[PDB]
Design an enzyme around this catalytic site. Structure first.
Site, mmCIF file in Angstrom:
data_model
loop_
_atom_site.group_PDB
_atom_site.id
_atom_site.type_symbol
_atom_site.label_atom_id
_atom_site.label_comp_id
_atom_site.label_asym_id
_atom_site.label_seq_id
_atom_site.Cartn_x
_atom_site.Cartn_y
_atom_site.Cartn_z
ATOM 1 N N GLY A 163 -4.307 -15.597 5.512
ATOM 2 C CA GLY A 163 -4.895 -16.111 4.296
ATOM 3 C C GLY A 163 -4.942 -15.050 3.235
ATOM 4 C CB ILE A 164 -6.424 -15.179 -0.033
ATOM 5 C CG1 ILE A 164 -5.386 -16.276 -0.122
ATOM 6 C CG2 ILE A 164 -6.524 -14.330 -1.304
ATOM 7 C CD1 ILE A 164 -3.995 -15.855 -0.549
ATOM 8 N N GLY A 172 0.844 -1.150 0.000
ATOM 9 C CA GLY A 172 0.000 0.000 0.000
ATOM 10 C C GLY A 172 0.886 1.207 0.000
ATOM 11 C CD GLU A 178 6.586 -2.601 -0.863
ATOM 12 O OE1 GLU A 178 6.019 -3.617 -1.321
ATOM 13 O OE2 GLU A 178 6.689 -1.526 -1.522
ATOM 14 C CB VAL A 179 2.448 -7.115 3.251
ATOM 15 C CG1 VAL A 179 2.183 -8.233 4.282
ATOM 16 C CG2 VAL A 179 1.747 -5.844 3.745
ATOM 17 C CG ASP A 237 -9.087 2.190 5.417
ATOM 18 O OD1 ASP A 237 -9.975 2.310 4.541
ATOM 19 O OD2 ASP A 237 -7.872 2.218 5.160
ATOM 20 C CG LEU A 238 -13.388 -3.960 7.974
ATOM 21 C CD1 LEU A 238 -12.172 -4.699 7.829
ATOM 22 C CD2 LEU A 238 -14.172 -4.329 9.236
ATOM 23 C CD1 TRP A 295 -12.216 -4.565 -1.723
ATOM 24 C CD2 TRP A 295 -13.544 -6.209 -2.476
ATOM 25 N NE1 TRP A 295 -12.328 -4.407 -3.113
ATOM 26 C CE2 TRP A 295 -13.141 -5.410 -3.586
ATOM 27 C CE3 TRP A 295 -14.416 -7.294 -2.697
ATOM 28 C CZ2 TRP A 295 -13.527 -5.710 -4.899
ATOM 29 C CZ3 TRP A 295 -14.811 -7.575 -3.970
ATOM 30 C CH2 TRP A 295 -14.379 -6.782 -5.067
HETATM 31 N N1 5ID Z 1 -1.450 -10.922 8.125
HETATM 32 C C1 5ID Z 1 -1.600 -10.993 6.804
HETATM 33 N N2 5ID Z 1 -1.812 -12.202 6.249
HETATM 34 C C2 5ID Z 1 -1.995 -12.273 4.932
HETATM 35 N N3 5ID Z 1 -1.988 -11.285 4.034
HETATM 36 C C3 5ID Z 1 -1.768 -10.083 4.585
HETATM 37 C C4 5ID Z 1 -1.566 -9.852 5.963
HETATM 38 C C5 5ID Z 1 -1.379 -8.439 6.090
HETATM 39 I I1 5ID Z 1 -0.877 -7.444 7.879
HETATM 40 C C6 5ID Z 1 -1.511 -7.882 4.853
HETATM 41 N N4 5ID Z 1 -1.735 -8.880 3.924
HETATM 42 C C7 5ID Z 1 -1.912 -8.703 2.486
HETATM 43 O O1 5ID Z 1 -1.305 -7.481 2.105
HETATM 44 C C8 5ID Z 1 -2.317 -6.547 1.652
HETATM 45 C C9 5ID Z 1 -2.009 -5.140 2.107
HETATM 46 O O2 5ID Z 1 -2.159 -4.925 3.511
HETATM 47 C C10 5ID Z 1 -3.647 -7.131 2.141
HETATM 48 O O3 5ID Z 1 -4.732 -6.687 1.321
HETATM 49 C C11 5ID Z 1 -3.385 -8.628 2.067
HETATM 50 O O4 5ID Z 1 -3.507 -9.179 0.742
#
Ligand code: 5ID
EC number: 2.7.11.1
Length: 327
Positions: A138-139, A22, A26-27, A178-179, A181
């Site tokens: 998860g996803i 975002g 980064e994640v 900010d919920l 999807w």
């Molecule tokens: N704990 C988690 N487990 C799995 N995926 C995660 C997280 C987190 I923190 C974030 N995301 C993934 O990264 C996107 C941006 O926040 C999210 O929209 C999401 O795709």
């Protein structure tokens, strides 16, 4: 501060794959002790624009840290207990340039999925970051747009979301704020029923084979003993000028609800987000199996009825306790 190697020792760093992004940063997903985890990395305190925005200061990032902790802790509480928020494993302040191995992962995602972010290769060795390590959830719901079984699953998702938000309202006067999807995560579970406790009353939710986790507390608010922790977006221009998705109307509707006073508690914002998610379920999600049985056609009609009545409830607590959908 610690080096990146503290959070991401060599094998753990080698196993990092980028999974999301975002403006914040980064994640990455990785694995340690045979268990997947998500690592959120946010640059702080520096002068550079990052993905077009200024970096948060330590003071500005603290609310997200505090809220992540408090929500995680609900999984171990008694009177108000839920596992519907994401587990927080650790939080570190890290100093260093961005690891080359994370840049390699970043590039792989850019090549396959495409990125809206700057390649994070411009930081110097004095740069600070916050690194939050979460449970792998998860996803996200957006990426599962075409992947869910049927609207029966949608009902379970909405019930889980409502229950989690209610427990957090009751415990912490929580608003997510900010919920969208992207922030609703779905993971397979072999549990047939999930458990929560609300003001000491325990109940269950049929899982339909999924566990929901709510993430991302960047705009969230809560309080303990009258000390409020929140993001003051009263002077933000851009947050209220979005277009093209009901998501952007929710920001505006929240501002209407609270008269632009973000420290106040207005749990109706949780209802607004739940309305936006219900709307996604009925309008944008597409299911592998359409509603063909009488039991399933009644489920669709009930979710439609939820969509057109839920805005007359005052909080996620009121919806959980009083809405016909959850009886
Ligand atoms: N704990 C988690 N487990 C799995 N995926 C995660 C997280 C987190 I923190 C974030 N995301 C993934 O990264 C996107 C941006 O926040 C999210 O929209 C999401 O795709």
């Amino acid at each position: 501060p610690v080096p990146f190697s503290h959070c991401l020792p060599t094998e753990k760093l080698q196993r990092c794959e980028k999974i999301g992004e975002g403006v914040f940063g980064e994640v990455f997903q990785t694995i340690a002790d045979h268990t997947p985890v998500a690592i959120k990395i946010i640059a702080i305190e520096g002068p550079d624009l990052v993905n077009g925005s200024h970096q948060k200061t330590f003071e500005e990032i603290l609310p997200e840290i505090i809220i992540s902790k408090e929500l995680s802790l609900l999984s171990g509480e008694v009177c108000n207990r839920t596992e519907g928020f994401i587990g927080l494993n650790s939080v570190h302040c890290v100093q260093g340039s961005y690891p080359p191995l994370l840049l390699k992962a970043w590039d792989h995602y850019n090549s396959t999925k495409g990125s809206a972010n700057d390649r994070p290769d411009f930081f110097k060795d004095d740069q600070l970051f916050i690194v939050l390590e979460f449970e792998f959830g998860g996803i996200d719901l957006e990426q599962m747009r075409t992947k869910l079984s049927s609207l029966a699953t949608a009902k379970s998702i909405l019930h889980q979301l409502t229950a989690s938000l209610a427990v957090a309202e009751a415990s912490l006067r929580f608003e997510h704020r900010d919920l969208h999807w992207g922030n609703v995560l779905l993971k397979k579970t072999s549990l047939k029923k999930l458990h929560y406790t609300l003001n000491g009353k325990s109940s269950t939710i049929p899982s339909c084979g999924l566990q929901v986790s709510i993430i991302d507390y960047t705009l969230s608010r809560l309080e303990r003993d009258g000390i409020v922790v929140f993001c003051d977006v009263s002077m933000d221009e851009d947050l209220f000028t979005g277009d093209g998705d009901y998501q952007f109307d929710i920001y505006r509707l929240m501002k209407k609800e609270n008269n632009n006073r973000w420290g106040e508690y207005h749990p109706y914002s949780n209802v607004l987000w739940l309305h936006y998610l219900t709307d996604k379920m009925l309008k944008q999600m597409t299911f592998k199996t359409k509603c063909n049985t009488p039991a399933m056609k009644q489920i669709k009609r009930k979710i439609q009825e939820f969509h057109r009545t839920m805005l007359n409830f005052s909080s996620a607590t009121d919806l959980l306790c009083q809405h016909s959908l959850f009886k």
